[PDB]
């Protein structure tokens, strides 16, 4: 078959375009290499190690075409290779292999990697390939395929190689960026507050492997030689890189630090985070790719990783229960915010029960009643979550993940600390499954928030049994919908592929199908490859006429 | 009927840390719930603090407890069933439930209490991998027994059990069988070895090889008969399984992970008491799973260990993070679970403090398809790798060379 | 005003300002002709199609219409002199680099754009799209949304769930 499957794990220390291949799998998969002067020595050597040692070989095929099995042959240790013979040898460091994860829905999901043979029994990926594969190391498995000819090797390494997939045509932007730990660490490393001592600097310098041995002069010479987080990260950025970004209220003096300015691959200001180093826009990875080429770019991923990870190892980072607690103050305010919405909902009930509520046009009373109640409840939840997020302080670990952009969101923090909020099946509040009540603990005809599944408590405080059940109800609805695509979508994608599968760009720039029928007179109506296309501003178009003339 | 949730709702300040309740009351109650925690089935009765978890994560746990290893029964040694997994050293969980009493969990537990640190530490525990202590593994952590048993009969004219000797056999040696055709307890097997030696009448070979990817020692061999006739045979094979890169492990909150790498104690980070994690999970696996219960279990279990008490993790009680935090503080630890830690490599403090405590972890089953179908074909087309496509999808069917007319 | 286009003129320019250590406090040695003629000539060179007839020549003019808008707006004389402050040397390098990046951006005959397209739409649809609608219903109430909607589309369903006219 020439292929292998196993569990995958992340490796801070592989290059972006590498795959750790367990030695034991590497012995099982061969490549037929024809014997030449350029390799006779190597092959001879390999044949001598045989099937059981790596780098070995499993067979030697002579001219006549006969395959000598090195597992059993009398002459396993007494073979003298001729030119023209083939040696089925083990895969080795730097062989291009094709690596893929299922289901593979788009093409950055089979990419060619360079092998790195390693101990233990899992495949190992650089952290930044995780996203294009939609992989994680919680039991996921992957397939490795070994090309079997000189032409197919070339094909893989010149067309599928990981670095050639960095900028993707899917959305005309990077499909890989700095993630997880490295994103968390990279923000922290680059705050104005981060300073490094000489001793630590020398290590970090030494860790970026394409380093020229020249110690950047410290941002602070006296009272003590001290180096910026920015200064050292900068070593990982290659010369001739320029980048310029302006977030909200960024000035040429960015009070908040905030924004991003890179000149000649030296960070002038701005905290490096997801909009600078994620798969952004953008975006240092976009920029380096385009200015410096895929190889140099692909190496950046590992330089930054090596440097940041090391800094992170010695700084440390954690999260705990205390990061979900709000000082309340905030609590009092959140409790009061909700007590407020229970009052607007009560006042609308009294109203609508007097028969004073007016319907709108083309909505029932009951419909337009529900609408009001759901908006009060939603904006209460909303502003209770906001109250919690402002109280989180800079040292707050969750808030730090968030700022760095590494997981998760407002909603996450809000359910945990403020208020889970309204459960819902089929887009309405919890239905009267019992006769006129949602549970037998209520009286009949009770449309209060409690009754219809507003969860008032956060996960921190824990749910009451009623809120527990209603939250399960909402729970299940999401599970069922996940189970309906898997596979309702693996089926759409198969249909989409079939309709388009034969469209190709021809040497006259037209796109045509297999009968040769014209589909677009020029591809994309502009003849361009989506992977070389990026958001740019058409100035000519905005502003007053006075502005344009000037 | 009208049902009261708590019996307290049948009677006639507010502690900020409690969850908010809404009564009315009521005066018209006909019944009252025995205990609300009773709406849960058997699986979910095992999750500590499910009322602080995200709804679907409870569901994931419910399927996962079913893949944990424990001690399925106490007579395990005398049953010869298809597969079995037993922990060497099951521990009762520091955070239990009232419902666990009736579920026999404390008695037949399915995990151990790891000292778990929540830390970014070297980066080998990202996207849900875990860093495990090689030294705790050395000392027994998560080590488990594994038994597989193979079966075979004779006949249905005749077949017989015997060591055969080439008069079409299988590759792996028949060396280990006695002459009755069976290996015997104590013999160490591996690879493809003939476990059961069977012949069909000179002689066509029908013996049972050992599962290719395995090994161990033979445990019991049983010879017997079915209600009529058949002499049949069952061979149980023992293996020990040491925690290892790529093995799966889960807390009781529906997030699994595998071991990314293992460090020895020296290389680990450490508290000032010289305490060291058995296990390091990533912070990033936390915010978004909405997995608060896991943090509370950890807070709760640390107090338990310190004080020698079972930590009550039952749903719908009055137990609170503040409660637990105040208990922990009394033990002289930082109220909120954090501890100052030092970097193993270096001994230097970490600039961050680490959430650090015990938590109950389950070892899950499985170590011990490959395909190029439609969708891989499409990726390679998308790359326009046509040579590879030709080579992968073809055959040794080799070029037959034919001649064709140019007109017809 | 922001639309995906090839060749990032802004960056080519910040490169030029860096490579040539552009002294912002001096006159440029660019003439008016250098710029106006320079830029006109560069458009003649942004090739997507090459056939020498009236039809392909028009198709070519159409193909680079939007890009040339961008180009003329970035390389307006005043903008070059007052904002960018390019020198004759820097400017000449901006032009030829735009040309090189441009030709480098053309799609390559042999691209399987079809599978490309399908995979580009399919992968997000199953990435997902999670839900389904939300749903809705009753209140506010409804409008179907992908995937059920994506399916209605691809099916060309005559019996669509929530048809709606928008009337201005």
């Amino acid at each position: 078959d020439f292929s292998a499957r196993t569990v995958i794990s992340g490796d801070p220390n592989l290059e972006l375009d590498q795959v750790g291949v367990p030695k034991s799998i590497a012995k099982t998969l061969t490549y037929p290499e024809v014997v030449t002067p350029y390799n006779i020595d190597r092959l001879t050597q390999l044949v001598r190690n045989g099937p059981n040692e790596h780098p070995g070989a499993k067979y030697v095929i002579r001219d006549s075409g006969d395959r000598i099995d090195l597992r059993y042959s009398k002459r396993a240790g007494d073979i003298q290779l001729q030119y023209g013979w083939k040696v089925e040898r083990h895969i080795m460091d730097n062989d291009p292999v094709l690596f893929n994860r299922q289901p593979s829905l788009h093409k950055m999901s089979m990419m060619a990697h360079r092998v790195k043979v390693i101990p233990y029994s899992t495949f190992r990926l650089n952290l930044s390939v995780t996203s294009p594969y939609n992989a994680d190391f919680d039991g996921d498995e992957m397939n490795l395929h070994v090309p079997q000819s000189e032409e197919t090797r070339a094909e893989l390494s010149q067309l599928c190689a990981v670095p050639l997939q960095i900028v993707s045509p899917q959305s005309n932007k990077p499909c890989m960026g700095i993630v997880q730990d490295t994103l968390c660490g990279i923000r922290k490393l680059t705050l104005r507050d981060t300073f490094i001592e000489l001793d630590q600097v020398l290590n970090m310098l030494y860790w970026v492997p394409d380093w020229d041995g020249v110690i950047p002069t410290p941002a602070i010479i006296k009272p003590k030689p001290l180096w910026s987080g920015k200064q050292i990260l900068s070593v990982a950025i290659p010369n001739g890189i320029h980048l310029q970004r302006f977030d909200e209220g960024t000035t040429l003096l960015s009070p908040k630090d905030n924004g991003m300015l890179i000149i000649d691959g030296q960070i002038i200001f701005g905290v490096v985070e997801k909009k600078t180093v994620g798969s952004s826009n953008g975006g240092l990875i976009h920029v380096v790719t385009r200015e410096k080429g895929p190889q140099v770019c692909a190496k950046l991923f590992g330089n930054i990783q090596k440097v940041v990870n090391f800094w992170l190892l010695h700084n440390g980072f954690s999260t705990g229960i205390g990061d979900t607690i709000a000082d309340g103050p905030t609590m009092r305010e959140i409790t009061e915010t909700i007590a407020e919405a229970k009052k607007k909902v009560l006042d609308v009930t009294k109203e609508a029960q007097a028969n004073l509520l007016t319907a709108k046009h083309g909505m029932t009373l009951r419909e337009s009643f529900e609408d009001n109640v759901v908006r009060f409840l939603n904006e209460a939840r909303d502003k209770a979550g906001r109250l919690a997020e402002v109280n989180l302080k800079d040292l707050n670990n969750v808030k730090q993940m968030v700022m760095a952009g590494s997981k998760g969101s407002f909603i996450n923090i809000a359910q945990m600390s403020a208020c889970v909020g309204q459960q819902s099946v089929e887009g309405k509040r919890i239905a009267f499954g019992f006769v006129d009540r949602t549970l037998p603990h209520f009286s009949k005809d009770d449309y209060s928030p409690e009754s219809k599944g507003f969860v008032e408590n956060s996960y921190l405080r824990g749910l009451t049994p009623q809120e527990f059940f209603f939250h399960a109800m909402g729970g299940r609805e999401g599970l069922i919908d996940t189970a309906v695509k898997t596979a309702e979508t693996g089926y759409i994608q198969r249909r989409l592929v079939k309709a388009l599968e034969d469209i190709m760009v021809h040497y006259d720039n037209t796109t045509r199908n297999s009968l040769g029928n014209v589909i677009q007179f020029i591809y994309g109506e502009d003849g361009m490859d989506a992977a070389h296309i990026e958001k740019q501003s058409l100035d000519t178009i905005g502003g007053s006429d006075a502005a344009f003339e000037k | 009927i009208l049902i009261a949730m708590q019996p307290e709702d049948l009677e006639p300040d507010v502690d900020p840390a409690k969850r908010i309740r809404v009564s009315h009351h009521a005066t018209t109650f006909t019944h009252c719930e025995i205990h609300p925690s009773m709406i849960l089935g058997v699986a979910a009765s095992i999750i500590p603090f499910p009322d602080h978890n995200q709804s679907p994560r409870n569901t994931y746990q419910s399927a996962m407890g079913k893949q944990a290893m424990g001690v399925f029964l106490t007579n395990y040694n005398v049953r010869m069933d298809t597969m079995a997994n037993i922990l060497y050293y099951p521990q009762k969980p520091l955070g239990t439930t009232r419902a666990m009493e009736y579920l026999k969990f404390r008695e037949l537990p399915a995990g151990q209490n790891a000292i778990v640190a929540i830390a970014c530490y070297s980066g080998y525990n990202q996207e849900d991998s875990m860093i495990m202590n090689q030294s705790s593994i050395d000392r027994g952590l998560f080590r488990s027994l594994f038994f597989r048993s193979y079966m075979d009969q004779e006949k249905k004219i005749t077949e017989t059990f015997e060591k055969p000797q080439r008069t079409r056999m299988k590759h792996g040696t028949y060396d280990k069988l006695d002459d009755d055709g069976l290996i015997a307890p104590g013999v160490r097997v591996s690879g493809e070895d003939v476990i059961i030696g069977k012949t069909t009448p000179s002689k066509r070979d029908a013996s049972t090889p050992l599962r290719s990817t395995e090994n161990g020692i033979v445990d019991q061999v049983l010879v017997t008969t079915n209600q009529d006739g058949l002499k049949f045979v069952k061979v149980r094979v023992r293996t020990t399984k040491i925690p290892q890169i790529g093995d799966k492990f889960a807390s009781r909150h529906g997030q699994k992970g595998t071991i990314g790498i293992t460090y020895r104690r020296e290389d680990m980070p450490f508290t000032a008491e010289g305490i060291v994690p058995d296990l390091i999970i990533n912070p990033h696996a936390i915010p978004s799973r909405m997995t608060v219960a896991h943090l509370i279990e950890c807070l709760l279990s640390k107090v338990a260990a310190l004080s020698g008490n079972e930590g009550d993790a039952s749903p719908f009680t009055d137990i609170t993070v503040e409660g637990i935090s105040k208990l922990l503080r009394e033990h002289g630890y930082q109220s909120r679970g954090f501890e100052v830690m030092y970097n193993g490599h270096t001994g230097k403090k970490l600039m961050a403090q680490i959430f650090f405590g015990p938590t109950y972890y389950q070892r899950l089953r499985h170590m011990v398809g490959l395909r190029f179908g439609e969708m891989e074909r499409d990726c390679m087309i998308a790359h326009g790798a046509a040579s590879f496509l030709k080579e992968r999808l073809m055959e040794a069917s080799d070029a037959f060379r034919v001649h064709i007319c140019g007109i017809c | 005003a922001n639309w995906p286009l090839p060749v990032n003129i802004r960056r080519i320019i910040q490169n030029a300002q860096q490579t040539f250590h552009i002294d912002h406090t001096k006159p440029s040695d660019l003439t008016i002709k250098d710029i106006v003629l320079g830029v006109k000539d560069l458009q003649e060179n942004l090739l997507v199609l090459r056939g020498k007839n009236e039809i392909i020549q028009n198709a070519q003019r159409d193909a680079v219409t939007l890009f040339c808008c961008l180009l003329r707006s970035r390389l307006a004389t005043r903008r070059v002199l007052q904002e960018y402050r390019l020198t004759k040397q820097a400017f000449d390098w901006v032009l030829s680099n735009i040309e090189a990046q441009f030709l480098r951006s053309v799609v390559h005959p042999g691209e399987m754009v079809g599978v490309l397209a399908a995979q580009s739409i399919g992968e997000p649809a199953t990435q997902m799209t999670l839900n389904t609608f939300h749903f809705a219903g009753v209140a506010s109430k409804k409008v179907t949304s992908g995937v059920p909607r994506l399916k209605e589309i691809l099916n060309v369903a005559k019996n669509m769930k929530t048809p709606s006219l928008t009337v201005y």
């Binding site: 939603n378 909020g421 459960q423 819902s424 109800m473 729970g475 999401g478 | - | 939300h134």
Partner: peptide
């Protein structure tokens, strides 16, 4: 599980 026109 969040609110109407968000999550169940």
């Amino acid at each position: 599980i969040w609110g109407i026109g968000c999550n169940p």
